[PDB]
């Protein structure tokens, strides 16, 4: 993509551009020896509010050193709580010690 | 009289999982578990490569 | 926004009566027990994805450890297939199955 | 005849929790940790006299499991696969073996399949000659029957 | 502290004109993989066959 | 003079394949008796026995 | 190469075989994530002197 700032800056008050962040976490750590490269790569537009909400599971790989890879989600005890089915028909989460 | 309900076998939800693989690993070897359990576990695992 | 009500108007008139489709019944003594405690007699021969159907059943050690653990909670307890049946009086066959 | 287990060997209930995948001397040796006292031992050779008990056997990766089998070899690890249900044969030495179970299969076979194995009769083998060219390398045997 | 045992019913009733079979059955049904009603229709349908 | 292992089979002579129980292996091993309704047996299954 | 031990063990008392060590120091450290492989690779003959 690359929303060119020309426009991110000045385009109709409506227009719904689809900018797109990178998800570096499964990025490869450059070979411990090889010589460096020399342009820092940056981004000039950051979302102003916590994005990724649909992200309920992150980084399904296993680092070798440190058990939990640097910041990885792992599904909440709901995306699999399949409680019962109320008599009335309103499926409701498994109890909690007699609640 | 009031024909309002249409029969179906395997219903879909208004929600689902969408994963994006970091094709760097994964192998594409479409993991082969047992047979009996391939079916039960079957998809979840294939999806979560 | 027009798409939101639309998704919504769609939910409005999205009336379907499920009617237990092609459902197998694993032979029991042919499923790791982790799967079994989880299973329940028959189960739709068309299960979908679900983080849980992969505990003690996936490489990624972390996540697996937590999931295997997450289920350990007093609350949450996963399930799957034929959970409760009521069956007409009079002609004693089985009516609606809660899957 | 089931080879009993020596004095040293420890009882370890197999589980997924043990075999992590760590880095050691470049390469990602699939270290085994040994519960009693945390001490990841990457390379199969040199682990520490463990008696492996398998109850699961349905969630092994075609490699963690192999490595464990691999460690059986060099480390004399004794792994007991407690969930298999096969049928013996005990068929005389004169026509010994055929259906060849290989170690890869014992490990990945579906919980159902009840495979035929076949142990040797051994007793009716006649003494080898007094001039038979000496045999150099030993015979190795792996599968044993846990019950009589 | 258990010695979970079979107690072959007959060693309870004195009028053994009802009591029949034996502890030998628990041994056997213990092996049958718990079947469903639909499952039995089949086991029976195929024996009769 | 020279028979090695002697076994007390179940003998197909009486339990002929005419009833299923196809012996051969020490195990009786019936067949499509109590299958997992909805699939397809499972070549050389354990419950066959 | 791979001096097969057949011979390193039993070949004329003369024969001058050219075995050859590896110089792992510029070896690449396997990607911090990728899944492991499973055969340890070893060598059964070490020079007896520096």
Curated annotation (Swiss-Prot), chain F:
UniProt subcellular location: Virion
Role noted for this protein: Inner capsid protein that self-assembles to form an icosahedral capsid with a T=2 symmetry, which consists of 120 copies of VP2, with channels at each of its five-fold vertices. This capsid constitutes the innermost concentric layer of the viral mature particle.
Protein family per UniProt: Belongs to the turreted BTV-fold inner capsid family.
Species of provenance: Bombyx mori cytoplasmic polyhedrosis virus (BmCPV)
Name the record gives this protein: Inner capsid protein VP1
Self-association state and partner proteins as the record states: Homodecamer; each decamer is made up of two conformers of VP2, called VP2A and VP2B. 12 homodecamers assemble to form an icosahedral capsid.
Whole-protein coverage range: 199 to 247 of 1333
Signal peptide: none
Curated annotation (Swiss-Prot), chain G:
Subcellular location(s) per record: Virion
UniProt family annotation: Belongs to the turreted BTV-fold inner capsid family.
Subunit: Homodecamer; each decamer is made up of two conformers of VP2, called VP2A and VP2B. 12 homodecamers assemble to form an icosahedral capsid.
Chain's role: Inner capsid protein that self-assembles to form an icosahedral capsid with a T=2 symmetry, which consists of 120 copies of VP2, with channels at each of its five-fold vertices. This capsid constitutes the innermost concentric layer of the viral mature particle.
Protein name as catalogued: Inner capsid protein VP1
Originating species: Bombyx mori cytoplasmic polyhedrosis virus
Residues of the full protein shown: 1186 to 1235 of 1333
């Amino acid at each position: 993509q690359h929303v060119d700032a020309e426009s991110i800056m000045t385009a109709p008050k409506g227009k719904l551009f689809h900018l797109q962040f990178m998800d570096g976490l499964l990025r490869p750590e450059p070979s411990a020896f090889d010589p460096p490269a020399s342009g820092e790569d940056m981004r000039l537009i950051y979302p102003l509010q916590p994005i990724s909400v649909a992200r309920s599971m992150r980084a399904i790989v296993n680092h070798n050193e440190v058990d939990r890879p640097r910041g990885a989600v792992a599904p909440s005890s709901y995306e699999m709580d399949t409680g019962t089915l109320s008599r009335n028909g309103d499926l409701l989460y498994s109890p909690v010690a007699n609640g | 009289l009031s024909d309002d309900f249409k029969q179906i076998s395997d219903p879909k939800g208004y929600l689902t999982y969408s994963v994006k693989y970091e094709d760097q690993f994964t192998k594409k070897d479409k993991l082969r578990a047992s047979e009996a359990d391939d079916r039960i576990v079957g998809p979840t695992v294939n999806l979560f490569k | 926004v027009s798409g939101l009500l639309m998704v919504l108007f769609k939910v409005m008139t999205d009336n379907r009566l499920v009617i237990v489709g092609e459902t197998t019944t694993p032979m029991s003594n042919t499923l790791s027990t982790v799967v079994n405690n989880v299973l329940r007699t028959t189960y739709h021969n068309n299960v979908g994805v679900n983080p849980a159907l992969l505990r003690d059943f996936t490489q990624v050690n972390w996540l697996n450890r937590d999931i295997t653990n997450m289920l350990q909670q007093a609350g949450t307890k996963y399930g799957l297939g034929l959970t409760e049946t009521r069956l007409d009086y009079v002609r004693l066959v089985k009516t609606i199955v809660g899957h | 005849f089931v080879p009993d287990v020596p004095e040293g060997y420890v009882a370890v209930q197999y589980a997924h929790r043990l075999f992590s995948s760590s880095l050691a001397n470049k390469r990602n040796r699939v270290t085994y940790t040994h519960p009693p006292t945390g001490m990841a031992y990457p390379s199969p050779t040199g682990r520490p006299h463990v008696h492996m008990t398998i109850n699961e056997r349905a969630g092994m990766s075609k490699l963690v499991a192999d490595n464990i089998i691999a460690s059986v070899i060099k480390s004399n690890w004794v792994v007991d696969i407690l969930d298999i249900e096969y049928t013996a044969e005990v068929m005389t030495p004169s026509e010994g073996y055929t259906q060849h179970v290989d170690a890869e299969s014992i490990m990945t076979a579906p919980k159902g399949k009840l495979f035929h194995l076949q142990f040797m009769d051994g007793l009716l083998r006649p003494e080898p000659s007094a001039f038979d060219p000496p045999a150099s390398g030993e015979d190795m045997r792996l599968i044993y029957p846990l019950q009589p | 502290r258990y010695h979970e045992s079979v107690l072959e019913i007959a060693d309870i009733f004195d009028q053994a004109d009802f009591i029949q079979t034996s502890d030998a059955v628990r041994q056997l049904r213990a092996l049958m993989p718990t079947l469903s009603t639909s499952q039995i229709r089949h086991a029976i349908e195929r024996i009769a066959q | 003079y020279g028979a090695a292992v002697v076994n007390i089979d179940l003998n197909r002579d009486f339990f002929d394949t005419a009833t299923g129980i196809d012996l051969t292996k020490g195990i009786p091993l019936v067949q499509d008796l109590l299958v997992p309704i909805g699939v397809t047996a499972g070549a050389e299954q354990s419950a066959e026995y």
